[PDB]
Every structure is written in C-alpha cells, then in structure tokens.
Amino acid sequence: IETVPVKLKPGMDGPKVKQWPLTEEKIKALVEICTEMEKEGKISKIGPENPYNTPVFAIKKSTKWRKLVDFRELNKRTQDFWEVQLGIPHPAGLKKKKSVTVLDVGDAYFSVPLDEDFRKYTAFTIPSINNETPGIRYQYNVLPQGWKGSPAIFQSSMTKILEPFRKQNPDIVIYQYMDDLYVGSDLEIGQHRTKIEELRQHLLRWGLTYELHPDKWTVQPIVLPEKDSWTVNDIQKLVGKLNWASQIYPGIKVRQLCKLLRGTKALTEVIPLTEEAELELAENREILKEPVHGVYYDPSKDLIAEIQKQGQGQWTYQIYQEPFKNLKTGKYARHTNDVKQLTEAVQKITTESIVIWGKTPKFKLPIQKETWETWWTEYWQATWIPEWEFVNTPPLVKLWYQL
Amino acid sequence: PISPIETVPVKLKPGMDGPKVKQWPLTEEKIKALVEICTEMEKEGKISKIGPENPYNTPVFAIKKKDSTKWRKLVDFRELNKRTQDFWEVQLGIPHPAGLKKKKSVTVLDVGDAYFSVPLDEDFRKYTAFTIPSINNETPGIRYQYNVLPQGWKGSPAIFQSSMTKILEPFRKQNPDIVIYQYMDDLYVGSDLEIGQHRTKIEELRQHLLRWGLTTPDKKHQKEPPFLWMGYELHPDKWTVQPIVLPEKDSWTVNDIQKLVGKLNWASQIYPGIKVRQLCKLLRGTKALTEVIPLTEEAELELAENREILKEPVHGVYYDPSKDLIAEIQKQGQGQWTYQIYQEPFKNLKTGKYARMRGAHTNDVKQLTEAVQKITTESIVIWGKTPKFKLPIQKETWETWWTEYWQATWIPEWEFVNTPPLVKLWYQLEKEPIVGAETFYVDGAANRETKLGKAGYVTNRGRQKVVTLTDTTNQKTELQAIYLALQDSGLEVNIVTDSQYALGIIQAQPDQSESELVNQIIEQLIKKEKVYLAWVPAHKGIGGNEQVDKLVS
Ligand SMILES: CCCCn1c(C(=O)c2cc(C)cc(C#N)c2)c(C(C)C)c(=O)[nH]c1=O
Numbered sequence: 001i002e003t004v005p006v007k008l009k010p011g012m013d014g015p016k017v018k019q020w021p022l023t024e025e026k027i028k029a030l031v032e033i034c035t036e037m038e039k040e041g042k043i044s045k046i047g048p049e050n051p052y053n054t055p056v057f058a059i060k061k062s063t064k065w066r067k068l069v070d071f072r073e074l075n076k077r078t079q080d081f082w083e084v085q086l087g088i089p090h091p092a093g094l095k096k097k098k099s100v101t102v103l104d105v106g107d108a109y110f111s112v113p114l115d116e117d118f119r120k121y122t123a124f125t126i127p128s129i130n131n132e133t134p135g136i137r138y139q140y141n142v143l144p145q146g147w148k149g150s151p152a153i154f155q156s157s158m159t160k161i162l163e164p165f166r167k168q169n170p171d172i173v174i175y176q177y178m179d180d181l182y183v184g185s186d187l188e189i190g191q192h193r194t195k196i197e198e199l200r201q202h203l204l205r206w207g208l209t210y211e212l213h214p215d216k217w218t219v220q221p222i223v224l225p226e227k228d229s230w231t232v233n234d235i236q237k238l239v240g241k242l243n244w245a246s247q248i249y250p251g252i253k254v255r256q257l258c259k260l261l262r263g264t265k266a267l268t269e270v271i272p273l274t275e276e277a278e279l280e281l282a283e284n285r286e287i288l289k290e291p292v293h294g295v296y297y298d299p300s301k302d303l304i305a306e307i308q309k310q311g312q313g314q315w316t317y318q319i320y321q322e323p324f325k326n327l328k329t330g331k332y333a334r335h336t337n338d339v340k341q342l343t344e345a346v347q348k349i350t351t352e353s354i355v356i357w358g359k360t361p362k363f364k365l366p367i368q369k370e371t372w373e374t375w376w377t378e379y380w381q382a383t384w385i386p387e388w389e390f391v392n393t394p395p396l397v398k399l400w401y402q403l
Numbered sequence: 404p405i406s407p408i409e410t411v412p413v414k415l416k417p418g419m420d421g422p423k424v425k426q427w428p429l430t431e432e433k434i435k436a437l438v439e440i441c442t443e444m445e446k447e448g449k450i451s452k453i454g455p456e457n458p459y460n461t462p463v464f465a466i467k468k469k470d471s472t473k474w475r476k477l478v479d480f481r482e483l484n485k486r487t488q489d490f491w492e493v494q495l496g497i498p499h500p501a502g503l504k505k506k507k508s509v510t511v512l513d514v515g516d517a518y519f520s521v522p523l524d525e526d527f528r529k530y531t532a533f534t535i536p537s538i539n540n541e542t543p544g545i546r547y548q549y550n551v552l553p554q555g556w557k558g559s560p561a562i563f564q565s566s567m568t569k570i571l572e573p574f575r576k577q578n579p580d581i582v583i584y585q586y587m588d589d590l591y592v593g594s595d596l597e598i599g600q601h602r603t604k605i606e607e608l609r610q611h612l613l614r615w616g617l618t619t620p621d622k623k624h625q626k627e628p629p630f631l632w633m634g635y636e637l638h639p640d641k642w643t644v645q646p647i648v649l650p651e652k653d654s655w656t657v658n659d660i661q662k663l664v665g666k667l668n669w670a671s672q673i674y675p676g677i678k679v680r681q682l683c684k685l686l687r688g689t690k691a692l693t694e695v696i697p698l699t700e701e702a703e704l705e706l707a708e709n710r711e712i713l714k715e716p717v718h719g720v721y722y723d724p725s726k727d728l729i730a731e732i733q734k735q736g737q738g739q740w741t742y743q744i745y746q747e748p749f750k751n752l753k754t755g756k757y758a759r760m761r762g763a764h765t766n767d768v769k770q771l772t773e774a775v776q777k778i779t780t781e782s783i784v785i786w787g788k789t790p791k792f793k794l795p796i797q798k799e800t801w802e803t804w805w806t807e808y809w810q811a812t813w814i815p816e817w818e819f820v821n822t823p824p825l826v827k828l829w830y831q832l833e834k835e836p837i838v839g840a841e842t843f844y845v846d847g848a849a850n851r852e853t854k855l856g857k858a859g860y861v862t863n864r865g866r867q868k869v870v871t872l873t874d875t876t877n878q879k880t881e882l883q884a885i886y887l888a889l890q891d892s893g894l895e896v897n898i899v900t901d902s903q904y905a906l907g908i909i910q911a912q913p914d915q916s917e918s919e920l921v922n923q924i925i926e927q928l929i930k931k932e933k934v935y936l937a938w939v940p941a942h943k944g945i946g947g948n949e950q951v952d953k954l955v956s
Binding site: 047050133233311371 | 412499502558561562583585761773784785786788805836844862897937938939943944945
C-alpha cells in the first residue's frame, strides 16, 4: 500500500517527552508486547540519532496487559494534519440518539504503513528498573494507536468499509474519534445490540476483531434547597449561591432575599420568608433548570472541565470554553479510592465530551500533580489521554455546585 | 582497534552546513606535537588525510599534559557541535546502589580508547576535517578527517553507548543469568556462579568484546573491591557513601557552608536523621562566597547532632527481590521529615530526607502525604515497586482529613506506627453555625495608593471595634480582622467574612505558615473550643457585612 506523506507544523520540532518511571510488572508487559510487535514488523529498534520521544504505559483495557502510548505532544505538534488538512466531521445527531455504543477499531491502523519520513517522530522508550540498562527504543512503521493522525489517514478506508452498513441502516450515526467507533441508533435496546453485532462482522472482514444513553443526559442544575426553617446562615448561603449563579444565568435576582438579612443578626437565628423572596426563589429555580441563555459552543476554542470533590464518592463537573459560561454541568458517583474515582470521572466526562462536540477537554484536576502522575495509570481504561493541569479548588466553587 | 559494527547515520541541523572555521596559526613545538600525534593516529586508522575539495575545517590545539612532557591533541568542536543534530539523551537516571541485587561475583572491565574504537558515519566524516598549519602558515597545512568518534564532539557519548549496547545484546540474550551494567566506557558484570565458572564467563565476555573491536583489562588488571563510583563505596554485600570529613573551622565562609550542606545532603542517603535546616538558614541573603557567616546557636547545635551521627560509619544492604520493602517516616521537626527503607528491620536499603514545603500554608497531614508521594516515586525508580508504609498517624486522623478535604488524595498500603511526634489535626472547624455564640462580622480594607489599612468587626451583641494598620495589603487586613474577632471572642465564636482569600487559608486547617499573622490566627484557633467560619458576597448589602464594611474606610 502507498503511504500518505505527513507534515509537522512548520518550524516546530517533534516531541521530546521523557518516559515516566514504570513498575517492573508493566515493564515486563511492555517488553513482551513490543518484542511481538517487532517480530510482526509494526515497530523497529532505533539508534541514538533519533532525538524524539513519547511516553508509553501499560493499562488493563479484561485481564490482558495492553500498551498505551501518550501522544498528546505529537498530536498537538501534528494538529494541522489531522484537524484541518484531513479530519473527521462530527455529527450533531450522535448526541441525540437513544443509545450509543463505543467499539475499539485501533487494530485497523496496524495494517497501514506510516509515512517513512514521519516514523522518527513516533519514537518511544521502554525504561528499565534502577537504570540498570539503557532503555529499549522503537519507532513505529505503521499507523500507531492514539495518534490523531491515524484515524485521519485511515479515514477513506473506513468510509469504504462502513458504506454498505451505512446504506442499509441510514438512520444510524457512526462517528470515528481516535481509536474508537461511536455508533448511535434509536432502536429498542435489543435491536440496537443486534445492529452492533452486524457491524462487528463488517469490521471483522477487514481485520477489526458498553452503551451510552445521551437522551438521558440532562443538566445537574445549581440546586436551591427547600428548607423548612431558614436561618441567617442558610439565607446567606442561598445568597452566595444566587450571587454565583447570577454571573452565569441572565435573569437571576437576589434583592427580595437580602432584605431578610437586615441588621447584624446571629447566624443561628430563624427568620420566616418574605412573600416576595418566596417568589424570587421559585423564579430562580425556573432559570437554573434551563440551559444558559447566551452561551454557545465555539468550535475554534479549547474545552475546559473543572471537577470538584464533594465527598461520599460524589464528584461535580462543569465544561466551558470561557470561565463560567457553562456548556454543560453534571455529576458522577461511585473502592473508596479518591484517585480511582477521579480517574473514572475524567473518562466519563471525556467520553460525553467526544459524543457532544467531537473534542476532548483540558481538565482542571483537584489533586497534587505528583499523586495523580504516580497513580492514574492504575485505573485508566481509555485509549486516549485528555490534557490536564492541576488546581486547588476555590473553596466557594465546591459548595455552590453541591446537591 | 576500530569496531566492525555498522555506523549510526548522522546529519546536521536541517538549515545548516558543516563548519568552516579557519585555523589559528600555532607555534612550532605545537605544530611538531600535533604532527607526531596525527601520524600515529593515522597509522591506527583513527584519522585519514585529505586534500581539498573538502571545504570544512575545525581548529586544533595542543597542550602540555600535567607537569610532564606529554602533548595532547585538543580539538574545538564548538562550531560543528552547534551545527550537529540533537541525539536522544545518552542515559537518564543513574543506578542507585540500594537497587542492586547482591552478587556472588563481580568483575569491572573498562573499554580502552573507547571513542576511537567506534566508527563514524562515512557520510559525516568530512565535517570533522581539521588542519595542522605549516610553520608561520606560509604553506598549505596537513588536512585530516576523523573515521572514528572524536573526543569532544556532541554525538560521541551517545553513539558509543548505543554501540556498546548493540554489541552486548547477543551475549545478554545467551547469558540472562549474568548482569551487565553499562556506565560510560566501563562495564560492570556480576553473576552467582563460583570463581570457576565466573572468570570463565568473563573471558568469554571479553572475547566477544574483542571480536567487536573492544579491548578490555585482563584478569590481572581488573580492579578489586571495594569499588568507588558516583560518590559511593560499593562492597560485596553492603554499600555506603564515600567517607566524609566535616572540617574543623573557627570561622565559616559561604562557600564552606555550601560544601558542608552538599556533603550532608549526600550523606543523608544512608545516615539517618541528618539535618540541614539550621545550616541552610545561614545561606539566605545575597552574599559573596568569600564572606564569613557566624553560626547561630541552632545552626551550631545542628552541626553538632550531625557531627555525632557521622562518628561511627553506617552502611546499606542490597536489594532482595523476593521480599517486600518497608518505608518508615518520622517527623524530625519543623517541616523536616526523615525516612528509612529496609526489608528486614532495621538493616536499611537506604534513607533520606524531606524538607520541602508546598505553598505558604500547610499542615502536617498534607506534608506527610507529600513525603509519602515522594518516597513512592523514588521506589518505583529504584526497585520497580511501591513500598509498604509505616506512618506516625492514626488511620482515623488520616481518614478524617481525607474525607473532609477538597483535594483528592491517596497513599498506598500503610499501617500506623507509634513513633512520636505523632501527626494530628490541631483544630477542627465546626460544620454548622454555633448556637449562642457571638457572631463577629469582620472586615478589612486597604487604600491602594496610601497603603493605610483598617481592620474591624461588628457583632450581633452590639460590639464594634476597628483598628488601623500601616503599610499593609488589602488581603492582610482581611486576616487581621479575623485575628481580631478571635482575640476578643469567647471559646465559641461564629465569624463571617467576605474574603474568599481568608476563608481559603483557614478552611484548609493550616498548622504552620510563612505568615506570623497566620501563625497568630492559628495559635488562637487551637485555644478555641468551637469556631465556625462562613463567607458572604461583598457589597450586596447583606446583614452585618454592610456595617463593618462602612466602618473601615
Ligand atoms: C563489590 C561491589 C558489588 C556491587 N554490585 C555491582 C557492582 O559492582 C557495581 C554497580 C554499579 C551501579 C557501579 C559500579 C561501579 N563502579 C559497580 C553490580 C553490577 C554487576 C551491576 C551488581 O549487580 N551488584 C552489586 O552488588
């Protein structure tokens, strides 16, 4: 087969990201795997004249070790190719479906040779314990998994493969993103599942050996309590919340509410509700359950996601492009391991984000950089990696999104 | 020799070309020295002479070795190096002795003339051309180019290392029982055979090295244990840092104290409870290395304690893959932490130290967790697995903190160990308002040009108090106002502020800070019985906030 030549962004150079230290068990797994990919000719050993590097890890998908390459740098340095030059259009109908199923079609790429002059940029390194030997270095000879260039390049082979299946069920939406296919229908759940098995067989003739329910995605509104007795404290909290909300949702009002908090009163003190505040309250509740008037998705901007830890296994999140113009808010819940849950939450959020916008968000993560870096691998099950940075949640933000 | 291993292809950075530096004319003895060297190199294949066209040149120089009468060939590749491609890093991270399996028998053997034993990419040789000038330069000089890896060129240490590795590969495949560590041009080799089958496998290893152009020490020039290396003293079944003298001095200079801290920090790898906080406070301030620094009382206390731990020699043991690792941590005092890692108590694989602070305000529970994380990453690197931990904190003290703190956190398998000082939470903020406790509505304020500050409060019991502060920032007044409310309040108090900033600091339950204020606030919070802290939107006319806001201006 003939290879599509690939060009970096002019000026800027390949990736030189250093390999994180790995536990012996994962090294063992990576060796086995890579020894086998090398026999099969997908990768080849490389000399010191290759300066570039990309991190690699082992995840568990199922109890077989899988190999995961972190191409975030590459992808960023490659962006022009897989987004502007080629690049899959994203269907608005995908999010509208009753059921969406995600299939791994990464094995497809291993059958297509990678542009010979691009290979050096796919370099990765298996480390050794205590630096006893030098790492083992490889680059890729075929479309690698996790590189946004691979689906970009395999795109036309993918259209060919899916065309019969698309012709026969023209109300099913199929969306490709990185190593995955996203398949959406409105069929009853059993017919949907049957239609996915049919698809697998199409995939199967070409070497490609869980369900979402997006309709039932709805806002996690900033929720206002329904107290029996109110205290100054509770009203103060109410005002703070509405005070937050009002910077996001046009129409929020707090005046009739403050009138109650008049003078210098003890926090623990009960005060009955003004007839007007009682209307204000309900009127604000109307506004929160609805989408934000004035906020729209700009396809040219990065997505961001903030996650707050609520305790008791609950996690709140928002997605936006410009701070606190929220495109979506939600929650996730339930191994009382903080990092495990957090890892789970990021993948759910990332997945929804792909279904909705065909884009992955940069995460603001409420955890110590080093802690997350040491552990996220142990629970990661996706084939991509979002961009993340680390943040100290503003104490106020957390309570305002409680439930 | 020159190894028969294929060459590494090489290039220069893309928009560039080989150097064209001109030769700085040289004295006659230098010219003579150079010629006597290049003739010799040329006879061994190391270099070849060329007649232009070759347009490239890199200057050469000759120097007199030590005090003796050897001349040496210095080449300045400064310019070619700039024009040469980047190579993948030679080898990042160096083994730590604590990570070595103990070995029945070890042999050290070093490659001779290591760089000159490896070929250079033919297509690249022409950029290494240099010229020995003629006397006073009046005639065309003698031009050579390199065939092998030049001392001083940018690619040499990398291409060498990769060569040694391709060469060693086949023998590693056939001899998995045998361990070879590559460091620079040295080779360290160990197995668990007896002096018989070992020396045998060694000579076999040399002969392999020899087919491949790499000469090595014979059984008679092979150095003997103890080995010294990267600042350690490796023995057959223990290891330690190389001996350390804390010098006797009446007066210390900046330079003297830095070297002492470095020697200390290095020593703390295996010597338990080394401290350097008090010696380090001394370095603070912009001083000249020549300057004498009087030791404070605590710094001389520190040097003392340190001097004592160093008195008897301590050593480390090697790693046994079949056993678990344990790490113990102890609070060694003010933001200082010390840890040990052993497999059978208390014979340490290694030890270490953790001083860092993370931000301006933290408590012990955070700090301990940060050390745990630091120790954890270090184990992954050295032994390829996380240690079993032993911490001076009750599972309940740690449980209370984790669940109520906003950040996600987590440490691997651990258990409690009663090694005081234990880490505890020194106060807890109430989770609801307190009934029948005075409510202080506090506030602070500052004029951006003036730098003058007011800080005060109002209470639901009618008290009011405001004070002035000179040269202060808008956020310093907001803490002051909270200190204020804590000073004049009883054992139980509610406090309302509009400062997210103050709220943030206090709600995180600090118990030490870079701020005297925050230390002051802390000392109060510990003296209290219940304190409940809450936040209100500024300038919405809310409750008592309006009043105390009006009073400060
Ligand atoms: C008698 C010392 C045994 C230490 N050792 C070694 C080893 O000898 C060694 C190790 C390093 C990292 C550097 C240097 C130097 N200079 C030597 C080895 C080597 C064969 C790797 C070993 O496996 N086990 C040891 O205990």
